[PDB]
Design a protein around this ligand. Structure first.
Ligand SMILES: [Cl-]
Lengths: 244, 231, 241, 250, 111, 235, 243, 240, 195
């Protein structure tokens, strides 16, 4: 019957590893690098678009940075189509929480929910896992500014600064070297871009090959503003930091 | 070889190996004999024990006041099929106020076993049955195989070394068929028939199991000192 | 090599089960042909009754799907009848839901979509048949639309299907290059059938008796098949000129 | 019976590749060339009508399809897969948008819905991916003119201009030299015809080429008058004659 | 409106002796002011030395008795031909009756 | 790969035969039936000295008149015990009486073959079901994952089963007392066990008509172990 | 290779090897035939007597569908019974909705579609029987034969099983020597002969003859078994011809 | 639905999927449980390969199931959340119906039952997780410590360890832990737990987590400085 | 059940609930506590149809306690009240709706403010300085309209509450057997044993 053709996506290896999760992580390691850096007064999200073209319409494009709600955003590394399935689920989950409790969803709760969905695909259903790793950048009134990551295994962890996708080993070493606890957003912006500029497989880092975003308390009085950078705004910050 | 992984696969010569392997389980099972005359129908079964401390596995199951069977192979499969017969006999009584015909009972078992041989996922039944009964057309004896094939017979035997008892009945055909209005002599012929399938071991008091049904005789099972008469 | 057992992509981007279903199409060794007249659409097919024990009246690969639509099949009869029964059901349901007779091209598309599903879904196999639908549509006029196991379909000026399709195809191609029109310029359907048979004889290089052929004709508001005697009359007219 | 294929037929290999998606892209590579170019006041999409037989009426087979009055689509790869996607795309534009908001969806969101359908065929049980790449051109009030590519994975990207299928590598190079941000629609059509001629072997005319535009509103194609706010579809398929006229000034 | 219940009349009587028991019942069966039958048995031998009668609506009465007789049969099959004691029969009948708590057997039962 | 409900060429279900191998790896359990009662005993087999041995529950009550001992993948037995308890109590609810030991065993065995592609595999545990009823008296049953059950006068299951069964072959007679049966279980357990038998790594239980099913205290078993040593040294 | 391991898989030939393997089970079975006559049809079958212990005239192989259709088959007997059970459900729903008894061609397609459905999936096995069937309806007499693939045609004479070649040869002679037609009572006699002549392929074990027929004149268009004197008359005619 | 039998027997009578789930537990970070006379302590390893972590928000290894029971684990982190959630739901469900909080044995029996169910259900793989469940029953001062594993078997322990290099720390506990006289105070119990982890951990900085549970819902997690004091005292006594 | 009152003062919320349980013509109990602690700083009183009241209250209690364990965090009174409202709004269009009216009194530790929410069985939520369900409000709202001042102390709130209970005991026909009074503030929940 049908058993003959079943790949068995949810089984252990003799060593005790989940085959499909490990192979999904291998897929993500070839995806464009995404970096998240958390500061005392905000969070930075930086991400590299993969080998673009001159004929790609950049200003209307979105492959890396997505908005989950007014307080939370994510950087994607892996299959974009897979990510959008999860993103729409996460957007709905946030709204369900807001309808139920009349309060914005705490960052960790949203992260745990998405991570639990990913976990389910590794334990039951016989389907392939989502080939996606997220960097969550968000804010709430309990823990303040928070950075998380999740991967196809459904395991998530918190971070001060973190990278996903390609060249994470090289990227994490550079972040570990220059990061300090008393750091600010403007400094974190510079660190993120400098890290990408060294780890990139491209010849030179330019505005058209980048997506950038910040989550600042830098908003009129006690509130949080999400800023998804425009192409011209990425070009200006590249000149300011002294990369181009 | 490559075509015995499941029941849904014909071999290149048109064989169903899973059905044939299920048929093999019957040959491993203990011997049981069935025979009938015009008035009565008799089942004789050699019960098997695990060891000296163990009891002897029951071989005969009652289905209705006028019908029952003996088993050889996987006993749980005989329990499933006998339960189905009990329900079908019972449906005939409640709905139609009618005792189920032995021939029709065989047809129902055939069709139930067949569905398991054509569908993926399931498996064939691993047991053979000898059904006896007395209905409106007199005494009957059936032989069920889990391939689906059901056969009405004067006498037969299934299980290990069953060929010896089957040959004896083939010689005695003209004699035991005429044993009308005499249950004890019909049982004697059945006990003498099953004896031809014995090696080393002999028929003891807790080894032998006999059942009978007839004209004015409900389906009753005899075990223990009740069969000491026939040893 | 399980990519050749079910309908999934091979490394070459191919579906081998679909390709092998195409090969089952010619298992019957029958050739069919379809052409359009002014007021009609004619479809002819070879009829082969090898066994003397067979009832020749029941041996047929042409089907009356609806009053207006006819269908000839190239492929094994079980799959042919599977497709026929479904097309009949679809044509009937269409009329009930939308209040008018299902067009030939719309039915072709529907059956093509069903075929497409079998090329994408694993548990369902493709049918090893090529379906040629014919009618005189009330909007588009004489119509020939053909479906295959890949889920492909297209309209035709004329067409041919079977082992020797290419010989028939080129024969028809050469005729339409001369006349420079998209149909057989002829008033009566009888003469269009005569054209169809004549050009099949020329292409295949074989003579036909009344029992060697099978003919279906589509006119306005009805489709029908010819009897052996109707074909005999057709063969007589061809021989006399 | 029952569909007992409840497991994925597309899985990650040790190298991290999704085999069935890669093989689907290979099927797209073998497919006939199609392209799209975006102008300041419009968008153009085009492809070759590769006729399987000269007896076949190529007018009946439509490679370029209307999805909404302001959105059109063309493909490269497996035609049957494209046909069912167009059916599903048209329906989802109504069920998931028009029946809710009382208006047709913007290009990017309809693309997103099509992309979703193609992603599900890459992960759901008992199915293979779609063997097509789509080029979707469209217009809406707040985003203006736009052109999107959609791949078998479900991934989609916006383009100023691009090409897919047989001779896409050469065609994309040709478009890079000719494209600028000040192109008028007629200039984009001219460039589209030049680009497409390179990939075509045989006959090159209005009957062998299929071309449509997203441009100005066509009140003559609306079918009714009396409502000022309804000004007609921006999608228009160019006729055989209209193509041949522009081939003389080529 | 359809009324699924009816009244077939009749009367039954059970008396327990020291080493015996009796269950009596009249043989008349009626609807409204008409006699259906002058002899329609109402008390039944159900096996295992148990007698039963379900008086009231005869259709429900016959159904119940039929189902209890069935219960006795399956009790033998499932428990090695064990005799169903009168107390066990009584508890079994409670579950048959309460099983249709929200669409009752319209009868007064005595065993 | 291959079907879960597949027959071998010899006419046996692969999965059932493989589950029997898992039971052979399990700890020893012994049952002995007499006219004065049925005794059940088990080897606890703690994997480490830090493991509190009293928490090892390999002897279990099903009802007041039915007890149960297990061997093999003991985690699998929990749903079997739950079903047995429910079956026993449910029958009391429907019939206002105790349920026959055989009928209880049959109910447990009906679960055995409910596996396919219902649960995904057979049970990897064998059970010794001991009890008493008015009809057939004191009884001992052996319930396998094949769906088959045999009645026994005495039975051993687990790793030292064939060695213990041979010893039960010679020792058992129809006139055994309860005290004699208790010592006999301890004697045979001590013989087949790897570690030295004491009250902490071995457990006794019995079922009598009067007192019902009782698991023995460690203090009570310790005396029976001491009584055993003396009577063996006596000759 | 591996194309023959799973049902509904096309080989590179365009063949379904599993269906072809089901045919081998049919070829292994006992001989069964069908003869179309003037106003009806006749069915006959070979029943191998495996043992003296078999009760004569009890293990009936030919089955009736509705009251006007007869069915006989060669191969796996249980598969044939399953097919007839379906046929009976199909005929019942037809008569339920449309009132009239199911026409034979209509009935033939109902079985055909059902058998063909068992070649569409790997989760099911093809039928291991070729079924000969037919009867009388409003349009007259009809005889059909249905293969494991779901393929069926109308027939003047039909035969299947181990002795099909021997039978087919005999049927071809009757068609040639009787163009104007054959009577019902003649067809019964000829049927008996053909089974006896076809028994040379199963000549090891002796056999039992079983015949049935539907005829507008002889049986009022209803299916009946040939019994008693008429059966013995057909056996005597058959025994005379072989000697 | 996906009904495929993933956990099945092999010729030698083993369920490989359950055994491979134990290998996932072997890979997991070390976790240890020690019960004193009037307390239980749960020690856990944090691998120091991951620095630049945010220890405020990172999921802690020890999880509260109720106010009186705690659960630590070794193995797949994602799998552990599913067991913890189910356990937390069952804890509140028990309070709702029985009007009494769960016993530690009951909560263990439930979690173990869930793990077992996943070893003979179609279309699912076993949990790659072993747990240590500790606490005090309602209105009871006797300490409780239980262990569970992927197969579904569970048992009570005077002291136990699971995870990577658990063989070494179990060796340590077997010689150092005395049943006749267990750690009388909280200090003695925590000290023995930290000592046992120091056989494996590497550095005694932020790599050791300690959680003390006392009777009557008295649970507290020790800080870095408090644990560091134990690490200092142990090594200073060792230098002799 | 009958009478449940609520009043939000400067630094606390006070809930008063009758002790009587009457089924038919008999007062079965005169010491019934018609409230459940949802969290350390949130209390819910309830009144409605028999059975439904307790079943609903305990169901809500279980859900909030579950949230507290999962997140190791106490929900705000506003968040709990919204959760409760949604459950009742869901309930009103069910096969058999919960026939329960509730008051939710809580102290928000974040904003350092007491909060009182009145929710009926339809899922009608309102935040109020003082609230009541059933026929209680017909007597008590007029008194509270007169005397209540927002800057009151807890002791002043209890005196104002005594004035409400005295009026109810004078003018209502049913003997509700006095009230159990509970205070919710920054330090948590406590019961006034003498009232
Ligand atoms: Cl469609």
């Amino acid at each position: 019957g049908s058993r003959r053709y079943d790949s068995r996506t949810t089984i252990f290896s003799p060593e005790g590893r989940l085959y499909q999760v490990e192979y999904a992580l291998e897929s993500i390691s070839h995806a464009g690098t995404a970096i998240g850096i958390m500061a005392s007064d905000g969070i930075v999200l930086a991400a590299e678009r993969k080998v673009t073209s001159t004929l790609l319409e950049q200003d209307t494009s979105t492959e890396k940075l997505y908005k989950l709600n007014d307080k939370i955003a994510v950087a994607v590394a892996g299959l974009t189509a897979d990510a959008e399935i999860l993103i729409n689920t996460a957007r709905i989950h946030a709204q369900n929480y807001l309808k139920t409790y009349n309060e914005d969803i705490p960052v960790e709760i949203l992260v745990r929910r998405l991570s639990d969905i990913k976990q389910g695909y590794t334990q039951h259903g016989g389907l392939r896992p989502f080939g996606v790793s997220f960097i969550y950048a968000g804010y709430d009134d309990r823990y303040g500014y928070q950075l998380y990551t999740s991967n196809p295994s459904g395991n998530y962890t918190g971070w001060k600064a973190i990278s996903v996708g390609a060249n994470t080993s090289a990227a994490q070493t550079l972040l570990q070297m220059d990061y300090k606890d008393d750091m600010k957003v403007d400094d974190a912006i510079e660190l993120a871009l400098k890290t990408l500029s060294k780890t990139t497989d491209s010849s030179a880092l330019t505005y058209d090959r980048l997506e950038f975003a910040t989550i600042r308390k830098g908003a009129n009085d006690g509130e949080v503003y999400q800023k998804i950078f425009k192409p011209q705004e990425i070009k200006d910050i590249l000149v300011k930091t002294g990369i181009t | 070889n490559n075509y015995d992984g499941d029941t849904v696969t014909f071999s290149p010569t048109g064989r169903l190996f899973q059905v044939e392997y299920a048929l093999e389980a019957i040959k491993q099972g203990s011997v049981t004999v069935g025979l009938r005359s015009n008035t009565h129908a008799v089942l004789v079964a050699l019960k098997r024990n695990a060891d000296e401390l163990s009891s002897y596995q029951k071989k005969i199951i009652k289905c209705d006041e006028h019908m029952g069977l003996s088993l050889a192979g996987l006993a749980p499969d005989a329990r499933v099929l006998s339960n189905y017969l009990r329900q079908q006999c019972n449906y005939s009584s409640l709905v139609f106020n009618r005792k189920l015909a032995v021939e029709r009972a065989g047809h129902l078992l055939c069709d139930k076993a067949q569905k398991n041989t054509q569908s993926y996922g399931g498996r064939p039944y691993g047991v053979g049955l000898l059904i006896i009964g007395y209905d409106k057309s007199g005494a009957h004896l059936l032989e069920f195989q889990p391939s689906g094939n059901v056969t009405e017979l004067y006498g037969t035997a299934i299980g290990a070394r069953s060929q010896g008892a089957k040959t004896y009945l083939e010689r005695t055909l003209d004699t035991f068929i005429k044993i009308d209005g005499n249950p004890d002599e019909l049982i004697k012929a059945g006990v003498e028939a099953i004896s031809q399938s014995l090696r080393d071991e002999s028929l003891t008091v807790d080894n032998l199991s006999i059942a009978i049904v007839g004209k004015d005789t409900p389906f009753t099972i005899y075990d223990g000192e009740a069969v000491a008469k026939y040893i | 090599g399980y990519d050749r057992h079910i309908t999934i992509f091979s490394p070459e981007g191919r579906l081998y089960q679909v390709e092998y279903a195409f090969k089952a199409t010619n298992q019957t060794n029958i050739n069919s042909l379809a052409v359009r007249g002014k007021d009609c659409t004619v479809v002819i097919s070879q009829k082969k009754v090898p066994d003397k024990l067979l009832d020749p009246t029941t041996v047929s690969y042409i089907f009356c799907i609806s009053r207006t639509i006819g269908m000839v099949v190239n492929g094994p009869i079980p799959d042919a009848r599977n497709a026929a029964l479904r097309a009949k059901a679809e044509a009937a349901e269409f009329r009930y839901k939308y209040g008018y007779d299902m067009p030939c091209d719309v039915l072709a598309k529907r059956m093509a979509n069903l075929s497409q599903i079998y090329t994408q879904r694993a548990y369902m196999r493709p049918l090893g048949v090529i379906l040629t639908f014919v009618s005189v549509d009330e909007e588009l006029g004489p119509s020939i639309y053909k479906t295959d196991p890949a889920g492909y379909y297209v309209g035709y000026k004329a067409t041919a299907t079977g082992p020797k399709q290419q010989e028939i195809t080129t024969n028809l191609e050469n005729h339409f290059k001369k006349s420079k029109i998209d149909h057989i310029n002829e008033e009566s359907w009888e003469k269009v059938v005569e054209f169809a048979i004549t050009h099949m004889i020329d292409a295949l290089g074989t003579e036909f008796s009344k029992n060697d052929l099978e003919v279906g004709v589509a006119t306005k508001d009805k489709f029908f098949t010819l009897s052996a005697e109707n074909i005999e009359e057709r063969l007589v007219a061809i021989a006399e000129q | 019976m029952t569909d007992r294929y409840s497991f994925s037929l597309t899985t990650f290999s040790p190298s991290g590749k999704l085999g069935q998606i890669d093989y689907a892209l290979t099927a797209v590579k073998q497919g006939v060339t199609s392209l799209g170019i975006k102008a300041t006041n419009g968008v153009v999409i085009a492809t070759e009508k590769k006729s399987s037989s000269p007896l076949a009426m190529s007018e009946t087979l439509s490679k370029v399809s209307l999805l909404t009055p302001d959105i059109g689509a063309v493909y490269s790869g497996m035609g049957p897969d494209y046909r069912v996607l167009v059916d599903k795309s048209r329906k989802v534009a109504h069920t998931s948008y028009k029946r809710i908001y009382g208006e047709y969806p913007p290009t990017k969101l309809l693309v997103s819905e099509v992309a979703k359908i193609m992603q599900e065929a890459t992960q759901s049980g008992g199915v293979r991916p779609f063997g097509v790449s789509l080029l979707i051109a469209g217009h809406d009030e707040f985003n203006g003119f736009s052109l999107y590519q959609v791949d078998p994975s479900g991934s989609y990207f916006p383009w100023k201009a691009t090409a897919i299928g047989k001779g896409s590598v050469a065609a994309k190079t040709f478009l890079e030299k000719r494209w600028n941000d000040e192109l008028e629609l007629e200039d984009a059509i001219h460039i589209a015809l030049l680009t497409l001629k390179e990939s075509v072997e045989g006959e090159f005319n209005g009957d062998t080429i299929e071309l449509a535009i997203i441009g100005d509103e066509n009140p003559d194609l609306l079918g009714y008058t009396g409502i000022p706010t309804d000004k007609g579809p921006r999608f228009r398929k160019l006729t055989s004659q209209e193509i041949n006229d522009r081939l003389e000034a080529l | 409106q359809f009324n699924p219940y009816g009244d077939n009349g009749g009367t039954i009587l059970g008396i327990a002796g020291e080493d015996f028991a009796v269950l009596a019942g009249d043989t008349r069966n009626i609807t409204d002011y008409s006699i259906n039958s002058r002899y329609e048995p109402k008390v039944f031998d159900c096996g295992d030395n148990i007698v039963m009668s379900a008086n009231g609506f005869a259709a429900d009465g016959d159904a119940l008795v039929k189902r209890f007789k069935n219960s006795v049969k399956w009790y033998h099959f499932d428990h090695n031909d064990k005799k169903l004691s009168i107390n066990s029969a009584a508890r079994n009948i409670q579950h048959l009756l309460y099983g249709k708590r929200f669409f009752p057997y319209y009868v007064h039962t005595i065993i | 790969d291959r079907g879960v409900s597949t027959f071998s060429p010899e006419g046996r279900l692969f999965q059932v035969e493989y589950s029997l191998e898992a039971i052979k790896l399990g700890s020893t359990a012994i049952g002995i039936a007499t006219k004065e009662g049925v005794v059940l005993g088990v080897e606890k087999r703690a994997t480490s000295p830090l493991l509190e041995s009293d928490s090892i529950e390999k002897i279990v009550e099903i009802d007041r008149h039915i007890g149960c001992a297990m061997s093999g993948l003991t985690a699998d037995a929990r749903s079997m015990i739950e079903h047995a308890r429910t079956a026993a109590v449910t029958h009391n609810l429907y019939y206002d009486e105790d349920i026959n030991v055989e009928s209880l065993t049959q109910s447990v065995c009906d679960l055995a073959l409910r596996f396919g592609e219902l649960m995904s595999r057979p049970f990897g545990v064998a059970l010794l079901i001991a009890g008493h009823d008015a009809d057939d008296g004191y009884q001992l049953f052996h319930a396998e994952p094949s769906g088959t059950f045999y009645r026994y006068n005495a039975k051993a299951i687990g790793s030292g089963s064939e060695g213990a069964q041979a010893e039960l072959l010679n020792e058992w007679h129809s006139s055994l007392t309860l005290k004699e049966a208790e010592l006999l279980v301890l004697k045979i357990l001590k013989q087949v066990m790897e570690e030295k038998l004491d009250e902490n790594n071995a457990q006794l239980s019995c079922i009598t008509k009067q007192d019902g099913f009782k698991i023995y205290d460690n203090e009570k078993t310790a005396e029976l172990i001491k009584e055993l040593k003396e009577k063996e040294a006596a000759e | 290779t591996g194309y023959d391991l799973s049902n509904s898989v096309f080989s590179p030939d365009g063949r379904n090897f599993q269906v072809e393997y089901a045919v081998k089970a049919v070829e292994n079975g006992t001989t069964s035939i069908g003869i179309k006559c003037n106003d009806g049809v006749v069915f006959a079958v070979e029943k191998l007597i495996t043992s003296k212990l078999l009760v004569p005239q009890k293990n009936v192989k030919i089955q009736v569908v509705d009251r006007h259709i007869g069915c006989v088959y060669s191969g796996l007997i249980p598969d044939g019974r399953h097919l007839v059970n379906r046929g009976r459900e199909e005929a019942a729903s037809f008569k339920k909705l449309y009132k009239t008894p199911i026409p034979i061609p209509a009935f033939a397609d109902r079985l055909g579609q059902y058998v063909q459905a068992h070649t569409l999936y790997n989760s099911v096995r093809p039928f291991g029987v070729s079924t000969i069937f037919g009867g009388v309806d409003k349009n007259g007499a009809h005889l059909y034969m249905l293969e494991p693939s779901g393929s069926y045609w109308g027939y003047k004479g039909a035969a299947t099983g181990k002795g099909r070649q021997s039978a087919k040869a005999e049927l071809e002679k009757l068609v040639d020597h009787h163009p104007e037609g054959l009577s019902a009572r003649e067809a019964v006699k000829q049927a008996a002969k053909i089974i006896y002549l076809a028994h040379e392929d199963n000549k090891e074990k002796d056999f039992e003859l079983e015949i049935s027929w539907c005829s507008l004149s002889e049986t009022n268009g209803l299916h009946k078994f040939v019994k008693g004197d008429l059966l013995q008359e057909a056996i005597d005619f058959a025994q005379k011809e072989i000697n | 639905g996906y009904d495929r039998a993933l956990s099945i027997f092999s010729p030698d009578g083993h369920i490989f999927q359950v055994e491979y789930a134990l290998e996932a537990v072997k890979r997991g970070t070390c976790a240890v449980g020690v019960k004193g006379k009037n307390c239980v302590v749960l020690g856990c390893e944090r691998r120091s390969t991951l620095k630049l972590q945010d220890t405020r928000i990172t999921p802690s290894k020890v999880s509260k199931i109720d106010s009186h029971v705690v659960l630590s684990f070794s193995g797949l982190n994602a799998d552990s959340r599913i067991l913890i959630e189910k356990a937390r739901v069952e804890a509140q469900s028990h309070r709702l119906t029985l009007e009494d909080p769960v016993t530690v044995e009951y909560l263990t029996r439930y979690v173990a039952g869930v793990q077992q169910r996943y070893t003979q259900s179609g279309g699912v793989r076993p949990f790659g997780v072993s747990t240590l469940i500790a606490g005090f029953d309602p209105r009871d001062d006797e300490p409780k410590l239980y262990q569970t594993e992927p197969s579904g078997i569970y048992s009570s322990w005077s002291a136990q360890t699971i995870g990577r290099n658990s063989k070494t720390v179990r060796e340590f506990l077997e010689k150092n832990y005395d049943r006749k006289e267990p750690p009388a105070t909280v200090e003695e119990c925590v000290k023995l737990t930290v000592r046992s982890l120091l056989e494996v951990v590497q550095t005694g900085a932020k790599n050791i987590e300690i959680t003390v549970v006392k009777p009557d819902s008295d649970i507290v997690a020790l800080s870095s400085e408090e644990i560091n004091q134990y690490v200092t005292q142990i090594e200073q006594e060792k230098q002799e | 059940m009958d009478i449940i009152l609520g009043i939000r003062v400067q630094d606390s919320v006070i809930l008063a609930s009758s002790k009587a349980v009457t089924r038919g013509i008999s007062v079965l109990k005169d010491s019934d506590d018609k409230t459940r602690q949802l969290s350390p700083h949130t209390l819910m009183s309830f009144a409605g149809e028999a059975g439904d009241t307790v079943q609903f209250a305990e169901y809500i209690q279980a859900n909030i306690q579950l949230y507290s364990i999962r997140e190791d965090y106490e929900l705000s009174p506003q968040a709990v009240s919204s959760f409760v409202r949604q459950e009742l709004a869901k309930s009103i269009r069910s096969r058999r709706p919960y026939q329960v009216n509730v008051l939710i009194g809580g102290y928000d530790k974040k904003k350092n403010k007491p909060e009182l929410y009145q929710i009926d069985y339809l899922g009608t939520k309102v935040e109020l300085p003082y609230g009541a369900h059933g026929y209680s409000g017909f007597y008590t709202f007029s008194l509270l309209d007169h005397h209540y001042r927002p800057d009151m102390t807890t002791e002043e709130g209890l005196d104002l509450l005594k004035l409400c209970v005295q009026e109810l005991e004078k003018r209502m026909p049913m003997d509700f057997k006095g009230v159990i009074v509970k205070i919710v503030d920054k330090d948590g929940i406590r019961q006034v044993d003498d009232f």
